[PDB]
Symmetry: D2
């Protein structure tokens, strides 16, 4: 976990995120999305639960990226929830929720759901 | 947004979270869950997209809580994605993803999805 | 269950659905949405698991509505997954997935997620 | 669509489902799950929106399976929402919601979310 999480990860869409897993569960870094109403790097922050594991389970973690930087303001935020699996072919398997700011009338259609798999190799 | 987000919020399950929205999109605080394999306060970190809004839309945001503290280690993490609506009756409407660390065989059933509504009044 | 499910239900958005729960787990009926790219009634079909319950649990069920009828073709379909709780104030609590047909390039943003609560009284 | 949907499909977990897409949007068939609290074949019913497409988009569809048959009663139901893409390598990409019947107290943790990709070849 932690040490193994720190580094650069790539997903199936071509996005990249670099993260540092701190000793006490913190995750800090940047995310660069290959799709969307995103351009450049965005700040990301999250947490992971280690003290994960005498039965080779994954380490649960999650992070958030608000899609605003000095080049774009997409008025939305995405949260990724999943687990890290280390080893030869380590990966982070996730499901994400992307919410856009809407008027109350369109709040029912404000959230998209999807999944992403990240590897240390691209892809 | 930001100023309006800062404070204590309560949801329909009886959980409470106190957060500080920093000038540049950061969200930091603690979460205390009324249900689950949670006991006491857990650290939370997230982001919000302001610079939100000439058409009274909500402010998109998200945060993560790893369910580990000095009393419990639930080997899981939850991410909440939604938007803040201010005013007389301000609220944060969210959808969440709770992922538990599993063995590869049970990874298909590792994530729960739900929704929570937070108000400044309980509830 | 079954008998209790049969009838007209209304949700918080003003939609209405009438369903018949058949003896062997089938659910058939129509749905009329108050929002969206929907107009009039659409056919719905689903299933419920009864033989549900010596510990007052809910009955799990789900149904699908393809948003095409003789007035509109929204090129999308919604599935609702949840459980029925009977009694004085019976309700069906659900989470739904709305998928739109997209080109491969936009498939990552093809699905919306939300939740709806249905009651026998409106609302 | 329709004709192309009819047939046997296999997903990454080893499950199999055979379906018939009827002329007017109906989907009927059986599902056999390789995981879970499932054993044998279960009935499935759903809908698809064709009249799908001068820009090679997918056909939106969804179906439900209640996990009860003459060998098992798992007190749960799963709904799959996604789209069919035909061609050389046709597939059905989905996201699913599995809800279990719970007591009111555990209703917050009643639904699991995941995703499955089905192909005509296994896998
Ligand atoms: O890498 C990405 N994953 C997807 N989810 C999201 O929010 N934007 C897309 N980019
Ligand atoms: O407040 C809570 N909301 C629910 N989601 C979650 O992760 N635990 C529960 N507690
Ligand atoms: O009643 C409705 N619920 C929401 N989900 C959906 O698919 N359309 C909306 N209408
Ligand atoms: O094929 C399967 N997909 C998964 N979702 C589900 O409900 N059970 C599992 N089996």
């Amino acid at each position: 976990a932690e040490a193994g999480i720190t580094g650069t990860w790539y997903n199936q869409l071509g996005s990249t995120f670099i993260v540092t897993a701190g000793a006490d569960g913190a995750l800090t870094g940047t995310y660069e999305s290959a799709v969307g109403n995103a351009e450049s790097r965005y700040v990301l922050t999250g947490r992971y639960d280690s003290a994960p594991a005498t039965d080779g389970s994954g380490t649960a973690l999650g992070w958030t990226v608000a899609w605003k930087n000095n080049y774009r303001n997409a008025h939305s935020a995405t949260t990724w929830s999943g687990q890290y699996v280390g080893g030869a072919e380590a990966r982070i398997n996730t499901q994400w929720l992307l919410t856009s700011g809407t008027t109350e009338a369109n709040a029912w259609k404000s959230t998209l759901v999807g999944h992403d798999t990240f590897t240390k190799v691209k892809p």
